[PDB]
Amino acid sequence: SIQAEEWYFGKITRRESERLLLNAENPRGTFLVRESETTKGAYCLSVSDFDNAKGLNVKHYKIRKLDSGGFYITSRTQFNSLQQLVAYYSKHADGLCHRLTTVCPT
Ligand SMILES: O=P(O)(O)Oc1ccccc1
Ligand SMILES: O=P(O)(O)Oc1ccccc1
């Protein structure tokens, strides 16, 4: 189950995810998965980043799930589980701000 998963923060707001991710100690790619505030049935992958122009900041990526069974941020790249999606993005940056590195601390 995903609610067992340490990176699944479940029902928390976008504002709260940003409060948690905007810690000067979080390296780029620090992340968590929460419920989407605006899309029913969807999740949201929240990720920290850092660069010389913007400093420490946060990105949000909607995760769709089909009753057909797939999970995805982009339909071009789907997975059989949310856990497999997290595993994949921890290895490949693709179009994200940075590959997933470490679970956001509480
Ligand atoms: O509104 P949500 O809770 O899905 O969060 C966002 C915000 C911006 C981009 C993707 C998702
Ligand atoms: O340029 P942004 O601040 O949107 O961050 C990135 C960097 C590369 C890909 C996606 C996001």
Ligand 1 centroid from CA 36, angstroms = 6
Kindly list the protein residues whose Cβ atom lies closer than 6 A to any atom of ligand 1: 14, 36-39, 44, 60-62
> How far, in Å, is the centroid of ligand 1 from the Cα of 37?
7
Which ranges in the chain belong to alpha helices (H)? 14-21, 82-89
Distance, CA of 95 to CA of 1 (rounded, Å)? 27
- Sequence-separated (6 or more) residues with CB below 8 Å from residue 68: none
Q: What is the rounded distance in angstroms from the CA atom of residue 99 to the CA atom of residue 88?
A: 9
- Give residue 52's Cα distance to chain centre: 22
Q: Number of structural domains, the chain?
A: 1
What method did the depositors use to determine the structure? X-ray
Look up the CATH number of the domain holding residue 49.
3.30.505.10
Tokens, residue 46: 């929240």
- Residue that the structure tokens 């900041």 belong to: 57
Domain boundaries, position 8: 1-106
Which residue is it, tokens 């122009």? Answer: 53
Resolution in A: 1.7
Residue/partner pairs of 43-47 with CB below 8 Å, 24 or more apart = 43/82, 44/14, 44/17, 45/73, 45/89, 45/100, 46/14, 46/17, 46/18, 46/21, 46/104, 47/21, 47/96, 47/97, 47/98, 47/100
Does 97 contact ligand 2 (Cβ within 6 A)?
yes
Q: Which ligand is nearest to the CA of 58?
A: 2
